[PDB]
């Protein structure tokens, strides 16, 4: 075809037959120079016009640009000399043509390198992929010329000496091409990096070298680009969301996935051509060791075939680690981009949803549209390409298997398919025992809150074991659903790890039995064993996949129902800037529901600007409905409302955001010190701020849990007053505040002399005191304005207002942590679940090492001389090594389950049995948030997530030490290569683990603020739309998502810089081993090559999962650090001591204090400073003093809650310090200031130990006056108590506590303000019962009510930790001491 073109033979096929093969020199200069040049010249126009359009300011010429230009200049000089030496010196066309095309091209390249100067990415994929294409194409000529020269045929040294230097530049320009850091454009180097630095993710080394030294912060992670930010995603999505939704409503007389495929169809198609290439390049290696096995079988083949399959087996496995990791970033970027156009598009819809179509949603569930329905669409697009990629890796891996083992392989496939039913029935039954366990996961935590919230009371009585066994007995019913759950995940893996071992036994055992003439070779047994690994995963995830898109089809149905909802109608409310009146009602009627009668009927009302107006009426008259209509919340039946100026709104239920007091009051407005202080004093908030430790900066909890109801209302009012709007709408703002405060607020804020004098004010109030100062009063009756007028006018009319007014008036006259878990499992049980794993790695090396000794038969016997006597010891002994792994992978996976739900049983058990024995100081110091997390989020990992991670590390680590024992026993010289690779792998261990942990703990840290914020804007939505501040919240939810993307996307590309360096170590091992099966081809059998290479081909998958399961064992093993720090905290004195007192002790109830001293903490000053007193038998004593004088402190000393710093306490002649704590506590009784009641039945709260009969309990209740109330209950003593007794009145709880005291009948009783929060009638009942029933017991009373103490035999005055006076009440009253002054101040 081209013979005359070169004048030499073109493609003499015999050139590729001799032991010294070489391509014809004409072919190299005829087809290996047009592939590269053809690639460029055919494609330069696209990459030159495309850059002119996207023009940018020229960058400063850096050194690398000039150098890249000089060298391309040389290729012009060297491409011109070549032509010169031809014209100057009969030559063929090829001798002067190809030289010219270099000059023509090198100019074009010299220009394209100049054009990139006006682009962000200097070294694009175009010219950085033409050097590769011209170095792997111009290297077949760097050998033909060099081989020719070495034979003394230096008759072409002119053309050769040029090519040997021109080719030395293409491999030097490429090196300069990879480097691209020539600016700081883009805060992230992701967009300035070159091609060879964007496919290997080598621009990510800066983050890793930064997080390895320090702890990463949100600033060390660069922001995402502009094409990925939220304000841009919600822009592209919007134009498609509405169009499909628009036509979706057309057919009404499913739209979300049409508006999500259209928005991203340049990433579904861009990453569809990389999963398709990855599938083409995944069956190359399985079909490329079929030659290294045949090659090693024969010692006659040529060496050049040996090294050409050891290079294409490393160059075709290097392109598949880039076409893949460059595909995993296109799929994992479309997930964080499909949950950001749905997160940021649900928020934007929360602010414009008709409240008629919002009451059907609950704030607890509308928030879940961002937490489970928008993250179930993030996890479906991450692997949405396995719908066709797992049907193409199956249709192919079954075809390539068929070509080798024929129809017999259907038996092999028939086994894997029969695992799909087992992988879908043990996954369903796994969810059942998981969700079924959520009941005991929650109700277990519910109780723990009660124990911690009220531990002080729990320690007063001997109720510790009562509650210690309540949780323990409540946990055994959870482990049984855990031990039975860890056995359903160690059987779904055991059937996945043993799948390739069972198919290999069935397939061969049927190939060599179903028919004679079938003999195994190394080209059938070892190239099909590595074909059962390509088909293992695609065929063992379909049940898990198609059950995860059908689960995401019920979530897209929710968003499709929320986003495509109705919109609030504001047509009724008109806004006119020229309107004379501030507000006006023109026959306006509003109804909450279209099917419900209007709550506001034909209201005609006109309001002038600046007027203070009050609306009054009976409860349920529609007052709150009127204010709702003003905001546009209520639906219009007929009429309209005209409004002029901005509107402020104060809800009856005050809505407080999460943040500081200063933040809520400002509400996004600039801070003005002068105005801000004026509002606080006007709002009477200064006293409130002073009490708070942080003042105006004090952080507000969820829904103002730290603030009182009256407080919240003032803050809500302060917010409106500060904002300074034209119209004010108030909904009973003074109901929750005191009368005097209301007067101050009204006079300084709402009244004619207040701050809002010049602004229109509407005040819906139930208080009739402010009406005389109101400009106009409106009376609402049955949804209609019954009467309207000024205060004096209404009184004269003698209407309903006067009638109601008269009615109102008539009523007014590290490795330690890794051991603590490991020891808990039982070191004995750890020897048998690591010996049974290593014995599986010894039946694996034996199972394949036996197959290499089986395929050797083909080289000895044949189809004729292969007896059944010898053909059965092979298929038999292989069927015994195929179940010798099935009784060590099953004996090591069950015994592991029993060892991981027993270490959890003995970690919670110790923790719960230690904090319950901790000194009171420990509980007060640490917040309840911590102690309740060591049972919520920590014991929830030691149970479920840590067991599954330590099991996949032992099975992985032994999966690589076994594969390094096969690769090494064949060629021992390979051992010296592992050391260079081990350092590379160990160095990647340190860098990835250090930085991957810090980035997925910066993901959860800022994953909730998206949701926590979403609760605020949806619960307090009506307030936001009132101020028109619904546009500073979109920008506040497009900034709480952009702060997550920067942390989620910075972790997605941290498993890419890894997967490319661990698929370059397990891929550099299938090379440095396949390249020693050719050097030593004279000693290695054909069988041994498959025995070694068929394993090394899957050392890249196993190396990744040993470095990712080494990262979860470092992020989850933190849990065991906290569960152990608390378990080893200091404890109180032993509950029971050898020196038990007599059973009747105490007999007289005498108490003696001897210079007693106590301090709350070692670092805090003494609370009591030498207390010395004697209390006689049956002596009634009252304790009085100023707050903080140590009154309540004395009680703690009696119960030994606070250990003595000095002195001693003796009861009935025995020092309490020598007695066990419980023995002392069971014989003392205290009625607490706060009557805390735990959840459960009344019987349990009264007698948790169940040591008493119902009759005694009923008798105690009768003495407590609670018999009637308890009898009235349907369940009686079995009546359930809510948390903290929220269903019982404060007096009822206190009476119930009295029931506890009357039951115990202790000789010593202590009353600590038992009647501070008790009404007089119940207080007298308590006193009467105490006086009668406890007349024969020593009673010590602490009370702020002196009259309750005048009956005491003696009264002690405590001040600053010292007893000043001690005597009878009469004697003290005669002496003008502190007691006299307090009694005088009390009116006595
Ligand atoms: C857990 C949710 C879930 C997922 C994520 C899922 C699909 C799915 N699951 C996995 C991971 C996976 N799981 C298993 C075993 C199981 N699969 C189960 O459903 C169960 C219960 C088990 C437990 C035995 C294996 C063996 C692998 C890795 C497989 C592999 O090596 N792939 C190479 C690339 S290729 O094959 O795709 O070409 C992948 C591969 C993605 C990957 O390579 N790494 C994860 C992302 S990244 O780290 O790189 O950033 C995919 C597409 N199906 C599901 O139900
Ligand atoms: C979302 C959660 C529940 C799933 C993630 C857990 C994954 C990463 C775990 C679960 C089971 C694990 C596999 C268990 C056993 C083997 C066989 C071994 O020779 C290679 C690794 C491999 C294939 C493990 C890789 C990691 C693995 C796939």
PDB file of C-alpha atoms and ligand atoms in Angstrom, residues 493 496-497 536 948 952 955-956 959 1101-1102 1105 1109 1112, ligand 2:
ATOM      1  CA  UNK A 493     -19.921 -11.927  54.903  1.00  0.00           C
ATOM      2  CA  UNK A 496     -19.452 -13.491  50.513  1.00  0.00           C
ATOM      3  CA  UNK A 497     -15.856 -14.341  51.439  1.00  0.00           C
ATOM      4  CA  UNK A 536     -18.337 -11.914  42.323  1.00  0.00           C
ATOM      5  CA  UNK A 948     -17.794  -5.087  62.016  1.00  0.00           C
ATOM      6  CA  UNK A 952     -12.720  -6.772  58.161  1.00  0.00           C
ATOM      7  CA  UNK A 955      -9.604 -10.857  57.177  1.00  0.00           C
ATOM      8  CA  UNK A 956      -7.914  -8.190  55.016  1.00  0.00           C
ATOM      9  CA  UNK A 959      -5.555 -11.624  52.713  1.00  0.00           C
ATOM     10  CA  UNK A1101      -8.670  -4.121  46.093  1.00  0.00           C
ATOM     11  CA  UNK A1102      -7.385  -5.684  49.313  1.00  0.00           C
ATOM     12  CA  UNK A1105      -9.666  -1.879  52.232  1.00  0.00           C
ATOM     13  CA  UNK A1109     -10.521  -0.214  57.711  1.00  0.00           C
ATOM     14  CA  UNK A1112     -12.411   3.318  60.972  1.00  0.00           C
TER      15      UNK A1112
HETATM   16  C1  LIG B   2     -22.220   1.311  54.517  1.00  0.00           C
HETATM   17  C2  LIG B   2     -21.537   0.136  55.211  1.00  0.00           C
HETATM   18  C3  LIG B   2     -22.561  -0.676  55.998  1.00  0.00           C
HETATM   19  C4  LIG B   2     -20.782  -0.721  54.191  1.00  0.00           C
HETATM   20  C5  LIG B   2     -19.272  -0.493  54.128  1.00  0.00           C
HETATM   21  C6  LIG B   2     -18.445  -1.666  54.651  1.00  0.00           C
HETATM   22  C7  LIG B   2     -17.482  -2.280  53.620  1.00  0.00           C
HETATM   23  C8  LIG B   2     -16.407  -1.266  53.237  1.00  0.00           C
HETATM   24  C9  LIG B   2     -16.866  -3.604  54.105  1.00  0.00           C
HETATM   25  C10 LIG B   2     -17.931  -4.623  54.590  1.00  0.00           C
HETATM   26  C11 LIG B   2     -17.394  -6.035  54.294  1.00  0.00           C
HETATM   27  C12 LIG B   2     -15.978  -5.805  53.788  1.00  0.00           C
HETATM   28  C13 LIG B   2     -15.329  -6.903  52.963  1.00  0.00           C
HETATM   29  C14 LIG B   2     -15.241  -8.197  53.759  1.00  0.00           C
HETATM   30  C15 LIG B   2     -14.295  -9.176  53.148  1.00  0.00           C
HETATM   31  C16 LIG B   2     -13.503  -8.927  52.105  1.00  0.00           C
HETATM   32  C17 LIG B   2     -12.690 -10.033  51.486  1.00  0.00           C
HETATM   33  C18 LIG B   2     -11.216  -9.665  51.381  1.00  0.00           C
HETATM   34  O1  LIG B   2     -10.462 -10.675  50.747  1.00  0.00           O
HETATM   35  C19 LIG B   2     -11.087  -8.383  50.590  1.00  0.00           C
HETATM   36  C20 LIG B   2     -11.848  -7.259  51.279  1.00  0.00           C
HETATM   37  C21 LIG B   2     -13.346  -7.537  51.513  1.00  0.00           C
HETATM   38  C22 LIG B   2     -14.069  -7.500  50.160  1.00  0.00           C
HETATM   39  C23 LIG B   2     -13.910  -6.507  52.527  1.00  0.00           C
HETATM   40  C24 LIG B   2     -13.791  -5.046  52.076  1.00  0.00           C
HETATM   41  C25 LIG B   2     -14.537  -4.039  52.958  1.00  0.00           C
HETATM   42  C26 LIG B   2     -16.005  -4.427  53.111  1.00  0.00           C
HETATM   43  C27 LIG B   2     -16.693  -4.461  51.746  1.00  0.00           C
END
